[PDB]
Write a protein that binds this ligand. Structure first.
Ligand SMILES: [Zn+2]
Ligand SMILES: [Zn+2]
Ligand SMILES: [Zn+2]
Length: 85
DNA sequence: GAGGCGTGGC
DNA sequence: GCCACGCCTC
C-alpha cells in the first residue's frame, strides 16, 4: 500500500521502512557512511554498508562444508556449491 | 567479486 | 530499524 509519492515512480512496498529506504534513491540521501581510511563509500540502507565493510576487515563468516574456502556473503557461498555437485 | 535491491523475522 | 535472505546486473 505504501507507494512512492514521486510523479515518475509508482513502486509500492509492503512495510513502511521499505518505502523510507526507496525514497533515498530519489533524494540521493545516504546516511550510512563507511568510516575506513580512504574508502568514502556511502549507502542508503544498513546492510550493504555492513556487507561492504567485510571487504576491509576480511570477515568471511560463511564457511564451505566441503572445502576450506569461505566467503563474506551467503549468495557467494551458494554459487560456490555448484562447483561441488 | 561487488553494489543495488525486494522481501521478511525479530 | 537491524539484518539476513536471495536475486539481479555489471
Ligand atoms: Zn520512487
Ligand atoms: Zn569502505
Ligand atoms: Zn567448497
Amino acid at each position: 500500500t505504501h507507494t512512492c509519492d514521486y510523479a515518475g515512480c509508482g513502486k509500492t512496498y509492503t512495510k513502511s521502512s521499505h518505502l523510507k529506504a526507496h525514497l533515498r534513491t530519489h533524494t540521493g540521501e545516504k546516511p550510512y557512511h563507511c568510516d575506513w581510511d580512504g574508502c568514502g563509500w556511502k549507502f542508503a540502507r544498513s546492510d550493504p554498508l555492513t556487507r561492504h565493510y567485510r571487504k576491509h576487515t576480511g570477515h568471511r563468516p560463511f564457511q564451505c562444508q566441503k572445502c576450506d574456502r569461505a566467503f563474506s556473503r551467503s549468495d557467494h557461498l551458494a554459487l560456490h556449491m555448484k562447483r561441488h555437485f
